[PDB]
């Protein structure tokens, strides 16, 4: 009743195996309070800024950047929709063509935080000059505690 | 140079992010669909704390 | 037929005031090209420097 | 002379990344210190 609860606590005091089993039960119950897995998902476009302010670079500046954590193995799947394009970031040593129907993978890991610029490096029309690339790199704890909370529905 | 070529695949770790890059005329598109899960950080200290909370 | 507005002298003076500093929308700003401008590895950006 | 300049630049890069690791080891020690402080608070929270 209540003494049997107290007798259970006395058996916790006495038997080490029962103590370990109830510790494992405590660990099972604490994992039940852990929130479940949630999906992170986004789909945005990145366009060149037509007019820039001081502190921004003409031709190379976009409106929406790609935010990537540092010290993390990142897979980049590159493809296209209509013609050939090339995703080139010269500071990160990645330049791989975007082919319609292909899914070209890149393994990338960034050493330091910063803002890295790029352009498209495959001729694709009249406005080939005006498809720039900007990658913003932040720390992994910021990425996993603040940035991914912007994409929880 | 051959050694640098064969080092371009670096899949010897647990991958942490996937980003789908799509090239259009004339702009870029970025996609992601992953899952965020949480894990109790060093639970055995909490296990012992609960153990000494229940023993008295 | 088109001389861009980032080459005018007012833009050039306001850019020279900022320097080679890139803003970030999720983090404090960062110095661009930290090796050729010899920023030390303890300093990441101007706002995070906070000079003594 | 060219390889001397290259080795000089690589030396600066190695010192840069060493300083960055020295800095990055400092916040993560203070983070675990704050975690231990919260653990010491939760310890007396279940004993009072």
């Amino acid at each position: 009743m209540s003494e049997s609860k107290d007798q259970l606590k006395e058996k916790l005091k006495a038997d080490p195996s029962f103590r370990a089993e109830l510790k494992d039960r405590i660990k099972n119950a604490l994992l039940s309070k852990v929130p479940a897995s949630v999906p992170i998902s986004y789909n945005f476009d990145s366009y060149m800024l037509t007019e820039v302010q001081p502190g921004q670079l003409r031709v190379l500046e976009v409106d929406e950047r790609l935010v990537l954590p540092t010290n993390t193995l990142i897979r980049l799947l590159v493809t296209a929709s209509d013609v050939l394009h090339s995703w080139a970031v010269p500071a990160l040593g990645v330049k791989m063509d975007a082919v319609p129907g292909r899914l070209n993978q890149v393994w990338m890991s960034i050493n330091r935080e910063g803002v890295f610029y790029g352009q498209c490096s495959e001729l694709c029309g009249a406005n080939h000059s005006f498809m720039p690339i900007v990658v913003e790199a932040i720390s992994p704890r910021q990425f996993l505690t603040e940035y991914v909370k912007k994409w929880i529905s | 140079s051959l050694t640098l070529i064969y080092s371009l695949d670096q899949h010897t770790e647990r991958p942490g992010l996937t980003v789908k890059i799509i090239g259009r005329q004339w702009y870029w598109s970025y996609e992601m669909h992953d899952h965020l899960q949480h894990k109790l950080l060093d639970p055995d200290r909490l296990v012992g704390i609960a153990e000494k909370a229940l023993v008295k | 037929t088109y001389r861009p507005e980032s080459l005018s002298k007012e833009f050039l003076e306001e850019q020279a005031k900022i320097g080679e500093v890139a803003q970030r929308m999720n983090a404090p700003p960062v110095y661009l090209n930290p090796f050729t401008n010899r920023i030390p590895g303890s300093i990441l950006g101007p706002e995070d420097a906070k000079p003594e | 002379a060219w390889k001397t300049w290259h080795w000089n630049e690589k030396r600066y890069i190695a010192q840069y990344y060493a300083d960055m690791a020295r800095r990055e080891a400092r916040e993560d020690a203070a983070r675990k210190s704050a975690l231990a402080d919260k653990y010491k608070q939760l310890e007396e929270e279940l004993l009072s």
Partner: peptide
């Protein structure tokens, strides 16, 4: 990270692979 006026060589790097490429180029 970004190109600079009157620049001769490559840009600065943030991956070990890009640094290794520049090292190979200087060796050649």
């Amino acid at each position: 990270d970004s190109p600079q006026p009157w620049q001769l060589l490559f840009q600065d790097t943030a991956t070990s692979t890009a640094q290794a490429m520049i090292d190979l180029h200087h060796d050649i």
